[PDB]
């Protein structure tokens, strides 16, 4: 059904995402158990890590487009990523390495993430009908690798330890590299312009140097979130001023402010919602016992299921508004399950969390998928920078919001943690509902401006 290169891209993306979500599923627990962080420290540190992983994304698109070539930058990103996973494995011998390791993973994602998509777009004559199914299938690939990693990494970390989990993330990257290398001939005429001139070692060195400096900067900022906060705060106020000096562009501004809320809420899955499953949910479903950390897998699961269906099935302003309503309902459901459907001992049915993750995945499908493809219709570089910088700030804020559910290490009673989760999730749901109503009200005007 699809070009031959498409399948190579499918599997390279699947395996890289396997490595990344292998780390994301276990990181907050790894901070708490293995490094002795409080839940508050773990949450904000995870926020800063996600902030850097997603804010550096604009670097790798530049490097792929104008310095090294899309294919070369894919390989270089995979190598730096594999290195970072193996360094995280090494952190168990050398705890002082951890932030450097995480810094190395962030720079790697930043270098590699824009580039498979780019390459895939170039596998299709510019108006190929197959394109849309191709990008749906690409998203499904991301979410299959994520589903497997989120399901299995906590089980592996429990049975064999963090060293083996992280080394397997490295192996995932190595097998991404090997499938790319073994399929190189399939993409011989596909690439960006530097892919077909000999590689410039001047520019390759500038990229290695800037990458290393960036690794040390990321490591510092994850160590000192209290100034990552200020860096991103001042950068946001300043670039806000330089966007206000300089109508569809305003449409993007409103949409991004709404996206910020969506990203705050998404940031809850690896932190607050993860600990809510640990502390106040039954760890058994349909008769099987599970690692509650694996509950995070419910996000890619529902995505993998709903994307074909929703591919078969107002337009953009409305689609964003719908996604925000679904998200609101995800957290209101969590709150209701805690307020009215808990056991005498403070535990709730895992079917409530299955439903929470359904609502949140549907919000993801309506906002995320549409967001990126279509911010492009309204508009370039300045706004793209703004998008990444704001998504990143959203992850820092998500970390901060998660800290309102942090539990001290000596609390052992579910009846003490349940009201905390229910209060925070209910307020999140009500604020997101208000944001969704405002969005609905602005839908007609916004649909005017898009004209």
């Amino acid at each position, epitope marked *: 059904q699809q070009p031959r290169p498409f399948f190579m891209i499918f599997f390279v993306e699947l395996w890289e995402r396997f490595g990344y979500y292998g780390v994301q599923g276990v990181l907050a627990v790894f901070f*708490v158990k293995q490094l002795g962080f409080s839940q508050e420290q773990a949450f904000v540190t995870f926020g800063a890590f996600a902030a850097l992983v997603y804010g550096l994304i604009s670097i790798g698109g530049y490097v792929g487009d104008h310095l090294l070539g899309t294919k070369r930058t894919i390989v270089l990103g995979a190598l730096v990523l594999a290195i970072g996973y193996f360094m995280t494995g090494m952190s168990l011998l050398k705890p002082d390495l951890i932030f450097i390791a995480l810094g190395t993973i962030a720079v790697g994602n930043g270098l590699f993430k824009a580039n498979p998509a780019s390459l895939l777009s170039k596998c299709y004559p510019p108006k190929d009908p197959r394109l849309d199914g191709a990008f749906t299938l690409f998203y499904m690939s991301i979410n299959i690798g994520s589903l497997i990693a989120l399901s299995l990494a906590p089980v592996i970390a429990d049975r064999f330890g963090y060293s083996v989990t992280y080394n397997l993330c490295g192996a995932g990257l190595i097998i991404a590299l090997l499938v790319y290398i073994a399929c190189r001939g399939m993409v011989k005429d596909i690439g960006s312009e530097p892919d077909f001139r000999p590689m410039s070692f001047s520019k390759l060195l500038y990229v290695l140097l800037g990458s290393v400096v960036m690794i040390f900067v990321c490591a510092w900022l994850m160590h000192n979130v209290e100034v990552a906060n200020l860096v991103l705060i001042v950068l946001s106020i300043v670039v806000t001023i330089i966007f206000f000096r300089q109508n569809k562009m305003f449409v993007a501004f409103v949409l991004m402010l709404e996206a910020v809320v969506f990203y705050i809420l998404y940031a809850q899955m690896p932190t607050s919602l993860n600990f809510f499953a640990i502390n106040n949910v039954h760890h058994e479903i349909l008769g099987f016992s599970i690692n509650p950390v694996s509950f995070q897998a419910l996000n890619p699961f529902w995505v993998v299921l709903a994307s074909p269906i929703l591919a078969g099935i107002l337009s953009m302003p409305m689609k964003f508004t719908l996604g925000m309503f679904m998200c609101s309902l995800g957290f209101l459901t969590a709150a209701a399950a805690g307020m009215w459907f808990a056991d005498a*001992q403070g535990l709730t049915s895992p079917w409530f969390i299955v439903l929470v993750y359904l609502f949140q995945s549907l919000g993801e499908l309506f906002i995320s998928a549409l967001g990126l493809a279509m911010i492009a219709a309204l508009v370039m570089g300045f706004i793209l920078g703004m998008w990444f910088l704001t998504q990143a700030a959203a992850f820092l804020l998500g970390g901060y919001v998660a800290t309102f559910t942090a539990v001290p290490d000596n609390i052992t009673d579910p009846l003490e943690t349940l009201p905390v989760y229910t209060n925070v999730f209910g307020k999140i749901g009500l604020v997101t509902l208000g944001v969704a109503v405002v969005m609905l009200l602005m839908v007609p005007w916004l649909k005017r401006m898009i004209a």
Partner: nanobody, 122 residues
Framework: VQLVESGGGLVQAGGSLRLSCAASGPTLSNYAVGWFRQAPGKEREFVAGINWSSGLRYKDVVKGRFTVSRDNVKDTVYLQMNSLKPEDTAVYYC?????????????????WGQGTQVTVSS
């Protein structure tokens, strides 16, 4: 996933026993371990437990007599039982739940030992 209890036995009022719980494949360090006990003709009840990060919980009638503790090197959890009285006679079970909570009912726990008999004679 499978726990082994050891150390039960028969002892006189005021004596001491130490139970120990050990796990097979998984690392018990991620688990809160609760000690339950079933006396003849009664339900299992929570007795004492330690979470994955040294939080502790005790049933009221055993406070000041039992201590739960954990040795993370040997991957073992202990229930030291002092000043034993006849009404501590029971089958004792260790149960494991991932994380930091110690819920009071057996349903909050999916992993269970087989039970060791403790008898305290007057």
């Amino acid at each position: 996933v499978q726990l082994v209890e050891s150390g039960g036995g028969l002892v006189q009022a005021g004596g001491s026993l130490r139970l120990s719980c050990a796990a097979s494949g998984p690392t018990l360090s991620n688990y809160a371990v609760g000690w339950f006990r079933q006396a003849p003709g009664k339900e299992r009840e929570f007795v004492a437990g330690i979470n994955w990060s040294s939080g502790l919980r005790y049933k009221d009638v055993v406070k000041g007599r039992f201590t739960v503790s954990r040795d993370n090197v040997k991957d073992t959890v202990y229930l030291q039982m002092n000043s034993l009285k006849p009404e501590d006679t029971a089958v004792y079970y260790c149960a494991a739940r991932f994380g930091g909570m110690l819920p009071l009912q057996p349903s909050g726990y999916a992993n269970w030992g087989q039970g060791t008999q403790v008898t305290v004679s007057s």
